[PDB]
Amino acid sequence: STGSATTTPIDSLDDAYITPVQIGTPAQTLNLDFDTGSSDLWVFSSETTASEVDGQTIYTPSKSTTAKLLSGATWSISYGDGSSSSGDVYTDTVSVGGLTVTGQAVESAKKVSSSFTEDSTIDGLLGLAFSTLNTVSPTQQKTFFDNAKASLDSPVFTADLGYHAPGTYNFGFIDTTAYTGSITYTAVSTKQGFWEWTSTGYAVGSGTFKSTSIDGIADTGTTLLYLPATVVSAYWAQVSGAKSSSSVGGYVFPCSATLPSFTFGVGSARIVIPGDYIDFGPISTGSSSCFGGIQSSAGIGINIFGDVALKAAFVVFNGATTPTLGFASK
Ligand SMILES: Fc1ccc(-c2cn3ccnc3nn2)cc1F
Numbered sequence: 001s002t003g004s005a006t007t008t009p010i011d012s013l014d015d016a017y018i019t020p021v022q023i024g025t026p027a028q029t030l031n032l033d034f035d036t037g038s039s040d041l042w043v044f045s046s047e048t049t050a051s052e053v054d055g056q057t058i059y060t061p062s063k064s065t066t067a068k069l070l071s072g073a074t075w076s077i078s079y080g081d082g083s084s085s086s087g088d089v090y091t092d093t094v095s096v097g098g099l100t101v102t103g104q105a106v107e108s109a110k111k112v113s114s115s116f117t118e119d120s121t122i123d124g125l126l127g128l129a130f131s132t133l134n135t136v137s138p139t140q141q142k143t144f145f146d147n148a149k150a151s152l153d154s155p156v157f158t159a160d161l162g163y164h165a166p167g168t169y170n171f172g173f174i175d176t177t178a179y180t181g182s183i184t185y186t187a188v189s190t191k192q193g194f195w196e197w198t199s200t201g202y203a204v205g206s207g208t209f210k211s212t213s214i215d216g217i218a219d220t221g222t223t224l225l226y227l228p229a230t231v232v233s234a235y236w237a238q239v240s241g242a243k244s245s246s247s248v249g250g251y252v253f254p255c256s257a258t259l260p261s262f263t264f265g266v267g268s269a270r271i272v273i274p275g276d277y278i279d280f281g282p283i284s285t286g287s288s289s290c291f292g293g294i295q296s297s298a299g300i301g302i303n304i305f306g307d308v309a310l311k312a313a314f315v316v317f318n319g320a321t322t323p324t325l326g327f328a329s330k
């Protein structure tokens with residue numbers, strides 16, 4: 001089997017991406033944030049604290065004939081950006097782009113943090129990291145991908161995020177028309193439950209490539225590119241007037257700037273992030289100071305190849321017995 005779903009930026013700056021997901025019988029379609037950095041499928045629901053729902057589409061398990069309460073199961077997750085949610089668990093039929101899993105744990109939110117409430121466009125998350133991170137207690141649950149894997153034509157999914165445009169998540173097959181050149185595969189460590197790999201270095205603009213190991217995770221659920229402070233300082237040094245702002249919370253640059261590209265290494269291959277990909281617009285409405293899409297990972301504790309990096313590539317999440325990552329230009 002296979003699945004293919006379009007993923008769509010939630011706004012004009014690609015601050016996140018949503019992908020429609022069918023849950024229950026009859027189908028309840030919710031727009032979920034596909035997150036290779038977490039491992040919980042959770043949704044706004046009829047159980048969510050009413051004051052914490054503001055525009056989101058909710059899952060109502062009582063209206064699904066295939067929904068079943070997973071007795072005694074609860075979940076609670078906190079994300080790196082400070083956001084959180086918690087609730088109870090159902091199993092139900094979940095379909096993504098034609099690919100169907102029965103008995104998928106659908107984690108129903110009873111509580112969500114303000115950032116989720118204030119995001120009317122995101123109805124929940126669909127985690128695509130390794131199931132070892134799943135927070136359901138007392139019985140850990142499998143991700144959508146884990147459940148689907150055996151049935152897929154190939155135990156893979158691919159992320160093809162668009163720049164200011166829709167893209168695609170595929171399950172079970174590699175669309176050889178969706179990238180240029182070849183896919184370069186690189187080793188993955190699952191020891192922290194992430195799609196963790198080691199980049200072979202970087203370049204700023206037309207600069208020389210710096211060969212250096214950068215361990216990090218491929219995370220569709222993180223918007224920006226977070227890299228070591230050395231690397232990040234070298235990037236923003238090439239932008240006149242760019243500086244790190246403690247008050248804003250990262251590197252900002254004059255909105256009048258033309259940003260240089262940023263290249264990262266995958267083995268001997270190179271993915272080039274165009275400068276435009278690195279502009280996340282005014283820090284506040286009307287400001288001439290813009291927020292940078294490359295930021296320091298110092299204080300996060302891990303380097304994160306988020307959407308800014310991933311959207312420059314066709315990315316293969318190979319869930320074979322020994323997982324790997326593949327990157328191609330496109
Ligand atoms: F510079 C940034 C711009 C947008 C986001 C951002 C992250 N999100 C996660 C779900 N919805 C989100 N919306 N926005 C983060 C940045 F650090």
Ligand SMILES: Fc1ccc(-c2cn3ccnc3nn2)cc1F
Nearest residue numbers: 037079080081219222300302304
């Ligand atoms: F602004 C931030 C953006 C991302 C993370 C963050 C940490 N993570 C650990 C594994 N997955 C993660 N995803 N995200 C933290 C931030 F403070």
